[PDB]
């Protein structure tokens, strides 16, 4: 019965905020749901009370928007919709430049953030 | 041993019962955001510290104008951003005549912020 109320998280909220119990037994799990603007990153969306009365979790929701990958020297990075999770951008080269690497990239779940499936290609020769 | 509180680029003191001329170290005065700015922080105070200087964190920031849209057969250039004070420029392609302004400023408009000049046209 070592854990107190769970911390407030930037990415998730508790499902069922009733309970009102101020102390939680070692081992109890609380189910969480992503706050708006965040996407599910892991299967397990829980907080667990461990032996030392701290809540243990990984970051299981992440901010949904990727950043713009930058300028494509000798070519073009085109937004099709936005830069949000799931969305895709396309790369093309101008003139007669040969594009090496990927022609598209999707904003996808990665590490402890969100990111591009493929990097910016190059436009050479 | 502080003197009267300053008006800052982004905020001015609440209560204009003017310059009671000296303030003891530790006094805090509430400020209000000047137009074109929004509250950025809970704390809107200046405090007079040991060295008789007013100390603050920055509690107001620039309001943001919106992007004005596409300029048919011309180009809209962000020089800085679209924030209060910033300027954008307009150009037309080829040999088109630009009618209207070649620039626009993000400026105070009544209770928000807005563009001094609208999108030009590119003609003939």
């Amino acid at each position: 019965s070592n854990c107190g109320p769970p911390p407030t998280l930037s990415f998730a909220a508790p499902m069922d905020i009733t309970l009102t119990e101020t102390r939680f037994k070692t081992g109890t799990t609380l189910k969480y749901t992503c706050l708006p603007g965040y996407v599910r990153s892991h299967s397990t969306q829980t907080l667990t009370c461990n032996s030392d009365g701290e809540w243990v979790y990984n970051t299981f929701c992440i901010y949904k928007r990727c950043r713009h990958p930058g300028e494509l020297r000798n070519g073009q990075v085109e937004i099709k919709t936005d830069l949000s999770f799931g969305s895709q951008i396309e790369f093309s080269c101008s003139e007669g430049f040969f594009l090496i690497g990927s022609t598209t990239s999707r904003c996808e779940v990665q590490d402890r953030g969100v990111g591009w499936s493929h990097p910016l290609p190059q436009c050479e020769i | 041993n502080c003197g009267p509180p300053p008006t800052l680029s982004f905020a001015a003191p609440m209560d204009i019962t003017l310059t009671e001329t000296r303030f003891k170290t530790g006094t805090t005065l509430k400020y209000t955001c000047l137009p074109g700015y929004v509250r950025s922080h809970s704390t809107q105070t200046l405090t007079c510290n040991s060295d008789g200087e007013w100390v603050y964190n920055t509690f107001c920031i620039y309001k943001r104008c919106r992007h004005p849209g596409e300029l048919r057969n011309g180009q809209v250039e962000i020089k800085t951003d679209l924030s209060f004070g910033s300027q954008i420029e307009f150009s037309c392609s080829e040999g088109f005549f630009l009618i209207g302004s070649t620039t626009s400023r993000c400026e105070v408009q009544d209770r928000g912020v807005g563009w001094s000049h609208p999108l030009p046209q590119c003609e003939i």
């Binding site: - | 929004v38 509250r39 809970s42 943001r64 849209g69 596409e70």
Partner: peptide, 29 residues
Amino acid sequence: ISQESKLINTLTDENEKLREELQQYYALS
């Protein structure tokens, strides 16, 4: 392509609305 500007406006408006929301918290001081 107008999509760059549309995204900029989307984020600008959303941030504005969010800042207004923070304003309610500031107001309680």
